[PDB]
Amino acid sequence: PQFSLWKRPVVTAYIEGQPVEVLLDTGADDSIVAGIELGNNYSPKIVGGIGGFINTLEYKNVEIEVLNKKVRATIMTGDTPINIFGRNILTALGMSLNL
Amino acid sequence: PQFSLWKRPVVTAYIEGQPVEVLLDTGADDSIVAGIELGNNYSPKIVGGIGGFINTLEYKNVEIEVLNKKVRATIMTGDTPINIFGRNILTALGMSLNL
């Protein structure tokens, strides 16, 4: 597909079966979604950005269906205002920022 | 040009002549940079990042040169840890996200 930037690149993603609304963000180094349960085998992380830091729990190798493609990648859960898919997932998806 | 996102889409843009380094952000609606001092009309404003709020000054009708294309735009200045160009400028350039 081709996403125009006139609208927020918001898609529906299926992480381990659970349906989430995610914003595709090329400035996000990682991916952080809230409100999803992914197990009792995680790693405590801390990520910073504009305005401050946020504590997160990292889960590797997680099934992800988005844009009619399934990737296995690392995601972080935590109190974030909107669910973000950073570059770690976009590269795994084969996406590009074109001019 | 084409950005692969394996290494963070960062470029040099000139804001009314001053060169800065900015990250191309597809999730941000607005744009904010640290340090530039302009004179256009401005309004005090506060924004919310993925971790907290920051106090900004907002300028309108700002001449911006990026990737060899000139534009007239709205941008914000404040003590941000990372300079980003959001969708308001991205769209004026005609950039897109493909798969």
Ligand SMILES: CC[C@@H](c1ccccc1)c1c(O)c2c(oc1=O)CCCCCC2
């Ligand atoms: C450039 C830093 C970036 C980021 C994202 C995730 C984790 C750390 C840093 C980031 C954005 O992409 C956006 C916003 O604030 C940010 O700090 C504004 C709020 C809305 C969310 C999308 C844009």
